[PDB]
Design a binder for this molecule. Structure first.
Ligand code: K34
Ligand code: ZN
Ligand code: ZN
Ligand code: ZN
Length: 572
């Protein structure tokens, strides 16, 4: 009922009744908002509505204070003050960007650009508003009632009329009813339920929308710079394997927070785990948005850090299988590995947050709200894939706008930059170096002479918005007969439908460019499928070709990215 202004902190009884988040606005800022937007409902102890019986006047501009009550022009008593006067909405204790965040639908890229260029308190309001909007949008899709069951990985569904059909990919997790979360893949659909329950005909699914909690802590704490390493105690006996990062581990102790831009295979998990061997007394909470990224940190920690002092935090509502080698849910262990949504309310000497391009400003704030740390380290790469923004359909979101950390890495540069790629053949390293790294990524390996590119547009068929290019999978099939060493390759494409087809025709294991992020394969076969803005995204293209250690075959649709690939060209 009584709080502080989300724009200038001035205390107030006023909240905008028309904002989806009902932000507390002060007398001055509340006016500047109601007078510039369709938002005219103002909430105090009592709402600002005409007290006259059955009068439906709720617009604060058309209301007045008569005695200690509120009335419109038609019912105001002789002695009355217009609620809107002198640039103020009457309340207690007596902005252009705030209006755009309050009224936007989050479908344009300029909406996300603003949610990142604004003040710190408006970044939290934007994050709070966007997530609530994203969640209410989930209520606006049709229910799937089972019509029949084929096998243990197949069934047929009956969709709700009038309400749309949502996309079928692991990117949209349904919730069955209460028989666990379920996923689907294209008349015979594949049912992938978290719980092994014999699919009941008639049982229905619903996209589980969660309550959006208010954000309190900033996306980034205020930066502090120190004269010496603070609260952390370094070893002088620091393993030669981690000698390359000694200087950067010292920068970590001489700042409140630090940003590390680590391109593919430059030593991000090495840096993260080596930080624990450099400050061995220090308690480190390892966080990431995805379970796969918290597990990738676990696999590196298993190798270099004592298994007893490690704990893998697993949320009680167990969704997908994760890391099984640490003691589970021991919040007090020196090394805690946990996803941002499952983070407990604790403190740490250092907090490492990896895969920073996948974080949102909502995630950044949750991290600063649940973990109080001496030091914060943000590891990732703004040249890699960001979190998918389900409501965004108009315009492409640039890296400086993924989150506050990525904004810093693209504007002032990262504090630390891992510049030598030790995974990829020089053909791949030189290509991504020129494409997204300003020629600052260096190749540790030589050219493998196993990196091929083929310009083949083929034929694009659509299965709803997901694309398939059978002539591109046919060209791969031809290639494999003549290059049987490529039998061990992972098939990568920007579309799951293209992958579903290539899995049946080639038999190769399948990965979307997005699900391949953080992983490495000896050989990669990539079919671009289409020459759309999705498949031609340079961040997605960067992740696509940097998965390969030994060889890559790129069947290209785009003349632009094909001409940018520094690979051996193939004919057919
Ligand atoms: C030492 N300096 N960099 C590194 C690594 N880069 C890739 C994985 S480990 N070790
Ligand atoms: Zn204010
Ligand atoms: Zn409003
Ligand atoms: Zn009235």
């Amino acid at each position: 009922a009584v709080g502080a202004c989300v724009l200038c902190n001035s205390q107030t009884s006023l909240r905008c009744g028309a904002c989806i988040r009902r932000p507390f606005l002060c007398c001055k800022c509340c006016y500047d908002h109601v007078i510039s937007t369709s938002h005219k409902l103002v909430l105090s102890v009592n709402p600002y509505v005409c007290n006259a019986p059955g009068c439906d006047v709720t617009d604060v501009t058309q209301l007045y204070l008569g005695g200690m009550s509120y009335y419109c022009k038609s019912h105001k008593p002789p002695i009355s003050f217009p609620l809107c006067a002198n640039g103020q909405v009457f309340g207690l204790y007596k902005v252009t960007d705030f209006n755009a965040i309050a009224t936007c639908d989050w479908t344009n890229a300029g909406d996300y650009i603003l949610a990142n260029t604004c003040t710190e308190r408006l970044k939290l309001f934007a994050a709070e508003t966007l997530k609530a909007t994203e969640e209410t949008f989930k209520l606006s899709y049709g229910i799937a009632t089972v019509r029949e069951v084929l096998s243990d990985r197949e069934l047929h569904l009956s969709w709700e009329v009038g309400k749309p059909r949502p996309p079928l990919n692991r990117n949209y997790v349904f919730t069955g009813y209460q028989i666990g979360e379920y996923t689907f893949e294209k008349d015979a659909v594949v049912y992938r339920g978290t719980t092994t329950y014999k699919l009941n005909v008639g049982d229905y699914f619903v996209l589980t929308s969660h309550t959006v909690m208010p954000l309190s802590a900033p996306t980034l704490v205020p930066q502090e710079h120190y004269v010496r390493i603070t609260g952390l105690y370094p070893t002088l006996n620091i393993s030669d394997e981690f000698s390359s990062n000694v200087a950067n581990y010292q920068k970590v102790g001489m700042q409140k927070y630090s940003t590390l831009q680590g391109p593919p295979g430059t030593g991000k998990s090495h840096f993260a785990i080596g930080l624990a061997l450099y400050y061995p007394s220090a308690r480190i909470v390892y966080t990431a948005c995805s379970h796969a990224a918290v597990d990738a940190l676990c696999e590196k920690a298993l190798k270099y850090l004592p298994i007893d002092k490690c704990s893998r935090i697993i949320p009680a509502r167990a969704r997908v299988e994760c890391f099984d080698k640490f003691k589970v849910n021991s919040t007090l262990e020196q090394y805690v590995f946990c996803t941002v949504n499952a983070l407990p309310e604790t403190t740490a000497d250092i907090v490492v947050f990896d895969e920073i391009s996948m974080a949102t400003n909502y995630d950044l704030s949750v991290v600063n709200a649940r973990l109080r740390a001496k030091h914060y380290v943000y590891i990732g790469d703004p040249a890699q894939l960001p979190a998918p923004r389900t409501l965004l359909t108009k315009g492409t979101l640039e890296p400086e706008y993924f989150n506050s950390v990525c904004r810093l890495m693209k504007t002032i540069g990262p504090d630390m930059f891992l510049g030598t790629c030790r995974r990829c053949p020089a053909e791949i390293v030189d290509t991504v170096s020129a494409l997204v790294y300003d020629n600052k990524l260096k190749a540790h390996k030589d050219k493998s002479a196993q990196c091929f590119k083929m310009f083949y547009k083929g034929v694009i068929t659509h299965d709803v918005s997901s694309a398939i290019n059978r002539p591109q999978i046919g060209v791969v099939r031809e290639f494999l007969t003549r290059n049987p060493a490529w039998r061990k390759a992972v098939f990568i494409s920007p579309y799951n439908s293209q992958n579903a087809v290539a899995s049946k025709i080639l038999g190769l294991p399948t990965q979307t460019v997005d699900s391949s992020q953080g992983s490495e394969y000896d050989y990669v076969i990539f079919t671009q499928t289409t020459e759309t803005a999705h498949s031609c995204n340079v961040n997605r293209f960067n992740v696509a070709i940097t998965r390969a250690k030994v060889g890559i075959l790129c069947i290209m649709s785009d003349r632009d990215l094909y001409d940018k690939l520094q690979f051996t060209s193939l004919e057919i």
